[model samples]
Target: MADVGDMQLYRIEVGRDDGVEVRHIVGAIANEGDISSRYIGNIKLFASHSTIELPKGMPGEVLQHFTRTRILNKPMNMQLLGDAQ
Candidate 1:
């Protein structure tokens, strides 16, 4: 996780090894904070999970969002979050 300017680049290492859970996770994050679609930032999705490009200090339980989409892979993206929430 990293913080800069007015945003944070958090690598939410959450996913499924089966390799098919990109959209779901994004939605989860959005729902987690009851965040609007514009708050989310860039997204980079790997076989498992990688990170999220969001602004600094977003209101929500960052880690809890992944409990349901846990994966065993390293991680990796998108500008999808905070876009359609």
Candidate 2:
């Protein structure tokens, strides 16, 4: 994970079939606290300013699902590292 200043990058791992919703996750994060703008990475990846670490072991189809369903409507800036091989 890449480090941006004082905040270290953190990953949120979820199962492909878990049926987890991005909005729910973002809501959870928001409920927990406000997300910092400094942590935001790429605008294309994340729709909001929140910097959430992409999950690992997610298939291309799952990613596509996330892109289409989760990321499409709500655009955000996030830094995505290459998939873990």
Candidate 3:
């Protein structure tokens, strides 16, 4: 199945407090490495943090690298939905 249903959810440390927007997160993830818009799926922003739908899995180093990507002057601190609080 080549659809977003197979995407994996991730939590982003940036949120409303930081005034983070979809474009900000998108640009951050895009600049990190090879992650493109296609690999990026649904994006949901909340009060404490934000969430995104990405490919089911990613390289450990890449995933770790993405954690440090900043958005709107704030660090993304990205994490897997299953891994972070």
Candidate 4:
């Protein structure tokens, strides 16, 4: 776990024959939050989002995959409790 301002970060590493599945990851996070009552955390699946500054840089294949998919234009359900800093 890591802390940056008001957000808490939890890193999850999944080892599947294929790359991590987005829906399963999201569902796991939601389930963990429900069981622990920790509603504040950020997720960065290696090929999904660029939250951390990677050392080797994101792979071209991952970047292209994200680009081809439709962006989530709808408002995110982020509930800010106070100022970020």
* Model 3, position 5: C-alpha lDDT score: 38
Candidate 3 residue spans exceeding 4 A from truth: 1-6, 63-79, 82-85
Residue-wise C-alpha lDDT for candidate 4, range 1-85, written one tens digit per residue? 2233334232333323324554445554345334221443443445433121112212344346445452221112222232332
Query: How badly does each model clash, as a count of residue pairs?
Result: 12, 6, 0, 0
lDDT of 3 at 16: 79
Worst 10 residues of 3 by lDDT: 54-63
Question: How accurate locally is residue 34 in candidate 1, as Cα lDDT from 0 to 100?
Answer: 53
Looking at model 2, the pairs that clash are 42-77, 42-78, 46-76, 47-75, 47-76, 48-76
Residue-level lDDT for 23 in candidate 4? 47
**Residue lDDT tens for model 1, 1-85:** 3233345455544555545465655666566555445566765666655556555454334336643454432222322233312
Alpha-carbon RMSD to native, per candidate: 8.4, 11.6, 5.2, 12.9
**Using Cα atoms with residue i matched to residue i, what is each candidate's TM-score against the true structure?**
0.46, 0.31, 0.56, 0.28
Most TM-score-accurate candidate: 3
Which residue pairs in candidate 3 have backbone atoms (N, alpha carbon, C) closer than 3 angstroms, thus clashing? none
Q: Write the per-residue lDDT of candidate 3 for residues 1-85, one digit (tens) a residue.
A: 2323345677766777767877667767666646676677777787767777655343455437546564542345765554311
lDDT of each: 0.48, 0.36, 0.61, 0.33
